[PDB]
């Protein structure tokens, strides 16, 4: 390897002496075209050179390499000619980086891979989804999850990323493809996935419950007359399998994850990770099963009963999810599912939940069922929760007295007895005190919160409506 | 002034009551005449007056909903003293004004609203200090008075932030905007914490005060538990008294 970095050099010159020229459009500008031809050289030479991988770092630039490729990146929308092998190529750039990436610069690669997702089309959006999880997550939750301690991206910016893919998607194939991968590869998922239905966009609070009922089937109360039954949950494609010397390489999922890199290279002409399937994976599973991880099948009928069949549970509907890899194979490769003091901020979700249910209201039985489940009214709740908890719960019973003949609106006010008075006579039971220091007129700062309180106006009408409340309130029983 | 204001205030009550009276040219130049008086272009009206003054442009704005581009009402200005004196006088009061929140009126939509979002980061960035502060103070007040209706622009925005952090324009402006960030929690900060515990919460500082405003963001930040959703009328008065602190800071002869 002599003239290969010298010419990988040429081309980061050449990229550095268009970048300090100020990007005025002059023509010619190489097009995608003749920018994926171009290198479409580099990718067979880096397949030559990724032949020999098995630490074997050639001295190449990966990291003025990463900046020339964000930038790049950013020139996508500025190009017009030759999107899709544009595409192509900085994904096949990128994949042939990772096994000869540095680790202070790929704390930050998924999340600035999610970066470019709205400068995007959305037909490169089906490839974007078909590269991801096969390449780009993976081995940052394999080959960098190994040193914690450090913050790592998957704690702290997974709700980020998760954020995006909600926003500038509207597939329910990418929406399950990224939900079932982030779940199924770290734990821990569901707290930063209440904690972006709590503190996310208000435009982002039906699909991430939505997208989230595929693998959460359970929060819907029994007897569940349901008509929204919009966009039943077809799952994503069948990965289509790179390893062009097997034998099935049509139709069939993956299994498990072939990450050798020469065997991988110099045997599918495809970058490594290779996603090998149940009959693709057996061959060098003997040896070699210590890089062979399980990855799960696409399940358009995730059921809701409870997906482990010693079913022992009386509610048929199961709450709590662990996803260990153990044994989650005996259906077809099929997610499994399962049945303290982290209650108070799963309840304060619920109070964002509800703020904007003012105005296709299910979140409201979804909360019904939320708060009966598994939140638990006790002393540990501190008194300014509580009297949040009650005038939140207040314009919730005055907003569910409006809302008039709509069919959702027909179902909140049908699960409104029989559900939350058992809920309010523990209430009366338990903090009564506190209730009716918070029907005082202007109570203390930690009850007379949220909601229209920014007016530029007067505020006795507030307490107006707030005894027309309390009308609506007493014949509630 | 307060028979001014009054006489401004009648005008205002004839906008409210009759909407058919805004097509001749003279109501157009008593607009013109009190925003050109209320800017001055040292002595300033009282808050009477300049409530009047804005609540006509709240009222002709969303009245003649097709004629009058902003550019000319959040009028022109080369001078950058000139512009923050617009960023404090005409800007904010308009923000606090026209949100109401009341779901069956209408309000701005978005193409007015998203300038007004490019033209306060247009002021930040260049496309020296009081005019930053402003400026970040008219970001505040537009990021909690528009939640609603910016559903589709903060990837962009999130990045100008970024742009922010990277350049510590103003200094301490900066980490009371982003202590107010992770205090109150607005939807921003979700892609904002990880840049926070990732980069700026990881390279240390350097200078005394904006180390002991670091560990201030940290204790607060680090705290993982239960944040306050606060009554935001509070909110509403820290802008009222931080428009007060500059008022009397600018009318003070330096």
């Keep these: ?477 | 002034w307060e028979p001014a204001s009054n006489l401004i205030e009648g005008v205002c009550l004839t906008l409210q009551r009759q909407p058919i009276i805004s097509f001749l040219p003279h109501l157009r130049s008593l607009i013109n005449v009190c925003v050109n008086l209320v800017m001055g272009v040292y002595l300033s009206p009282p808050l009477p007056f300049s409530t009047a003054v804005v609540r006509l442009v709240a009222l002709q704005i969303q009245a003649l909903k097709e004629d009058f581009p902003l550019s000319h009402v959040i009028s022109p200005f080369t001078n950058q003293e000139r512009r923050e004196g617009m960023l404090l006088n005409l800007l904010i009061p308009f923000v606090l004004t026209v949100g109401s929140g009341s779901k069956d009126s209408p309000w701005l939509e978005q193409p007015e609203v998203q300038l007004l979002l490019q033209t306060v980061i247009n002021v930040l960035l260049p496309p020296a200090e009081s005019t930053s502060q402003a400026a970040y103070l008219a970001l505040k007040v537009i990021l909690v008075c528009f939640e609603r209706q910016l559903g589709s622009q903060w990837y962009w925005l999130s990045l100008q932030v970024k742009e922010m952090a990277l350049r510590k324009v103003g200094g301490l402006a900066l980490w009371d905007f982003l202590d107010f960030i992770v205090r109150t929690r607005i939807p921003i900060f979700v892609l904002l914490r990880p840049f926070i515990q990732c980069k700026l919460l990881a390279q240390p500082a350097e200078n005394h005060e904006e180390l002991s405003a670091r560990q201030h963001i940290a204790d607060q930040l680090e705290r993982r538990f239960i944040p306050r959703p606060l009554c935001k009328s509070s909110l509403i008065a820290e802008f009222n008294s931080e428009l007060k602190i500059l008022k009397e800071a600018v009318h003070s002869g330096s």
């Design chain 1, 1 to 477: 390897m002599s003239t290969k970095a010298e010419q990988f050099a040429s081309k980061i010159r050449y990229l550095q002496e268009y970048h300090n020229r100020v990007l005025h459009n002059i023509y010619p500008v190489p097009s995608g075209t003749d920018i994926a031809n171009t290198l479409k050289y580099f990718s067979q030479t880096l397949l030559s050179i990724l032949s020999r991988t098995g630490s074997d770092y050639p001295s190449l630039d990966y990291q003025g390499l990463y900046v020339t490729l964000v930038t790049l990146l950013d020139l996508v929308p500025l190009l017009q000619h030759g999107q899709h092998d544009l595409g192509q190529s900085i994904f096949y750039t990128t994949t042939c980086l990772l096994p000869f990436l540095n680790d202070d610069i790929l704390s930050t690669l998924p999340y600035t891979m999610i970066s470019t997702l709205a400068t995007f089309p959305p037909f490169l959006h089906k490839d974007i989804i078909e590269y991801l999880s096969t390449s780009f997550l993976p081995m940052a939750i394999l080959g960098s999850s190994r040193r914690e301690g450090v913050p790592a991206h998957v704690n702290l910016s997974a709700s980020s990323m998760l954020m995006i893919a909600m926003q500038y998607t509207s597939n329910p194939v990418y929406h399950c493809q990224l939900l079932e991968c982030l779940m199924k590869y770290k734990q821990e998922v569901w707290k930063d996935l209440l904690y972006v239905i709590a503190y996310g966009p208000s435009q982002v609070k039906p699909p991430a419950v939505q997208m989230l009922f595929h693998y959460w089937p359970n929060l819907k109360p029994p007897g569940a007359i349901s008509e929204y039954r919009g966009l039943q949950y077809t799952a994503w494609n069948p990965i289509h399998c790179q390893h062009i010397e097997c034998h099935n390489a049509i139709n069939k999922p993956a299994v498990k994850m072939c990450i050798d890199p020469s065997l991988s290279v110099a045997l599918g002409d495809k970058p490594p990770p290779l996603y090998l399937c149940e009959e693709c994976s057996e061959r060098i599973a003997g040896d070699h099963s210590e890089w062979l991880i399980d990855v799960l099948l696409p399940q358009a009928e995730i059921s809701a009963i409870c997906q482990k069949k010693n079913c022992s549970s009386h509610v048929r509907r199961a709450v709590v999810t662990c996803f260990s890899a153990g044994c989650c194979g005996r259906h077809g490769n099929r997610p499994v599912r399962y049945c303290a003091e982290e209650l108070v901020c799963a309840v304060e979700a619920v109070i964002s939940l509800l703020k904007e249910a003012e105005f296709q209201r299910l979140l409201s039985q979804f909360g019904i069922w939320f708060l009966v489940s598994l939140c638990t009214p006790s002393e540990n709740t501190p008194t300014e929760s509580l009297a949040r908890l009650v005038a939140m719960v207040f314009q919730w019973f005055h907003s569910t007295a409006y809302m008039m003949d709509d069919e959702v609106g027909s179902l909140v006010e049908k699960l409104k007895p029989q559900f939350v008075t058992k809920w309010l006579k523990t209430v009366c039971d338990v903090r009564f005190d506190v209730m009716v220091m918070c029907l005082l007129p202007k109570p203390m700062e930690f009850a007379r919160v949220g909601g229209y309180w920014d007016k530029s106006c007067s505020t006795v009408t507030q307490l107006k409506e707030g005894l027309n409340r309390i009308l609506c309130l007493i014949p509630y029983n």
